[PDB]
Amino acid sequence: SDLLGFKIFGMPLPLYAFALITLLLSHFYNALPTDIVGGFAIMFIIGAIFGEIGKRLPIFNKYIGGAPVMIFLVAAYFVYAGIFTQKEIDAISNVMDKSNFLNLFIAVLITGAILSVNRRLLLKSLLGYIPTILMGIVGASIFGIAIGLVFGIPVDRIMMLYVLPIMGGGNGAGAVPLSEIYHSVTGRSREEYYSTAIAILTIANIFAIVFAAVLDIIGKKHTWLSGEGELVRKASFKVEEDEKTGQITHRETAVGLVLSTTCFLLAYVVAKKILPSIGGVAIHYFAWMVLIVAALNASGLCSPEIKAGAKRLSDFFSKQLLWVLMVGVGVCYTDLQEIINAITFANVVIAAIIVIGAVLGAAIGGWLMGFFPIESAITAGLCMANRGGSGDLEVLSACNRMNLISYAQISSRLGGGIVLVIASIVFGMMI
């Protein structure tokens, strides 16, 4: 009797049916409060129903991306089909354009991602590890612009729509903020940007898993190419000597929210009044926030107890409320026609070239930095060009290397803001 026992969003079926009845009744009678409570009420039901179907689908889930993609696709298709009542559209747009819940979400993700890094590990990475990532980015850039010249695509479009979104952390953090920055600096429409970027991102995600173990085979051919199992060539040994307190109180977890809100306020004040522009180019508030949080981690003022708490809270937003946000993301940002128009042979060869360009740079840099070349890519350009943290367990699983999880997490999380800074700089300079 699978009709009794099958679970939807951690819920037995009859309870969900009761929940859906309320939404159907409200749609029938056309009565709805327009506020946070009214918003969540109709977002949760739609997200829950349309996410389980996406997750439990054979080919879609592992490769195309899973729930959020098809969720916001269906949201866009309803919007285009003119099914939603005007009150429903108003109530959905209110909690994202006047309550600005998106800003709170983004700030929480950024601070929770960065603050969890170990202070000693962060300081040690400052020596030669970060430059590998930076030069991987720049090495990908030159091949990207070169191959874009081949098809006659102008420089500005390649530098704003193909290099940055690919070299990010997924649409949770790496695409939406890019669109906000793009709207802030230039002033044109933002629907086009996100719509055309999300496609390329998914396309690249596939290629990432593709060459994942291909390189492993080449390494099997000749170790002369690179040593396996060790990040650095002739790597030595050391002692972690880590120490944390396991117990975390509800109060300890809450502190994380206070820190996140504070950092955002400081960033808004510095960009708007303390420094209008560092040089001839203005800096967006989000870019300033990434640097400020890093400074707090560097100081080490915070206790080890606090660092863990922000990790837990950021793990609650990224695993539960993401489905609720993604629906609104689809509603107010997506333009369906662009998605279809974005699929062509040039659009699938450009991303194939750029990923290869990334791998080459990080690899040579690692050898120069002394690190073993094979890992000098997987853990520096491959794992860095993914859908954020979700796809990082996949590329590593493709090869026989589970020991590099710490470095992979460092790569993804810490690069999630460096790219933001670089994108702000590029947007200011070129335009």
Epitope: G82, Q86, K87, D90, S93, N94, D97, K98, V331, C332
Partner: antibody, heavy 118, light 109 residues
Framework: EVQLVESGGGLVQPGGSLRLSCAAS????????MHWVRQAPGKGLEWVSS????????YYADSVKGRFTISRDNSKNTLYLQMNSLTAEDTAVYYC????????????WGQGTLVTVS | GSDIVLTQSPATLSLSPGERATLSCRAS???????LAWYQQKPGQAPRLLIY???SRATGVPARFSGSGSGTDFTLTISSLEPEDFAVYYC?????????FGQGTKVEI
């Protein structure tokens, strides 16, 4: 946040036909219902017409029913008002606004144009 | 018509900055859900929104205006006028799909 009409205007003989256009550059024009409101010189405000997003539902004021036409183009962030069989008393300044529902009724306005019957 | 009819009692005002406006607006029949609005318009420009619901406030408005009342009776009181605050004020309802406007009181000195 800028909304403007900047269309039509001038002196029109009775039975004349005039077209009014509106442009909005501050918000997401789509997914928002628009309204037309006119005010006669020396007189108070008055509703004219309104339209949903996607134009599914259209409603007119009783006075100008059957001679007026309203349309929109989301792709161009542009609103059109079509006027036919103009009469003498239809002299006023015509405004277009955005109806935002519960979170404020008429938040943003536009600089209307003057249309006068000759 | 079966339409809400909006009538305002005072016609015009002429007082010094320090006073209460006690402007009023009466309706034909019951207006559900307290859907109401108030606008002001200085000469030669578009109107501006002050009290979007029956009790709440807009963003830029100061803290001297305040609305109240429900059913078929409403008010709008000003704590203390200033030289910048002489213009015409209207009465707007949006209950049904037939918007209706009241008239505009005048405020002078």
């Amino acid at each position: 946040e800028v909304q403007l009409v900047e269309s039509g205007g001038g002196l029109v003989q009775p039975g004349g036909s005039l077209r009014l256009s509106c442009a909005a550059s501050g918000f997401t024009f789509r997914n928002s219902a628009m309204h037309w409101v006119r005010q006669a010189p020396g007189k108070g405000l008055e509703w004219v017409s309104s339209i949903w997003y996607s134009g599914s539902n259209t409603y007119y004021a009783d006075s100008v029913k059957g001679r007026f036409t309203i349309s929109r183009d989301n792709s161009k962030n542009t609103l059109y008002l079509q006027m036919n069989s103009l009469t003498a008393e239809d002299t006023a300044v015509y405004y277009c606004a955005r109806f935002a529902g519960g979170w404020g009724a008429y938040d943003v306005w536009g600089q209307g144009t003057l249309v006068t019957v000759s | 018509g079966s339409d809400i009819v909006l009538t305002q009692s005072p016609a015009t005002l002429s007082l010094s900055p320090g006073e209460r406006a006690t402007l009023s607006c009466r309706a034909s029949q019951s207006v559900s859900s307290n859907y109401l609005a108030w606008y002001q318009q200085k000469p030669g420009q578009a109107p501006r929104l002050l009290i979007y619901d029956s009790s709440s406030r807009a963003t830029g408005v100061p803290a001297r205006f305040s609305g109240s009342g429900s059913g078929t009776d409403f008010t709008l009181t000003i704590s203390s006028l200033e030289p910048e605050d002489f213009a015409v004020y209207y009465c707007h309802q949006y209950s049904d799909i037939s918007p209706t406007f009241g008239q505009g009181t005048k405020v002078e000195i």
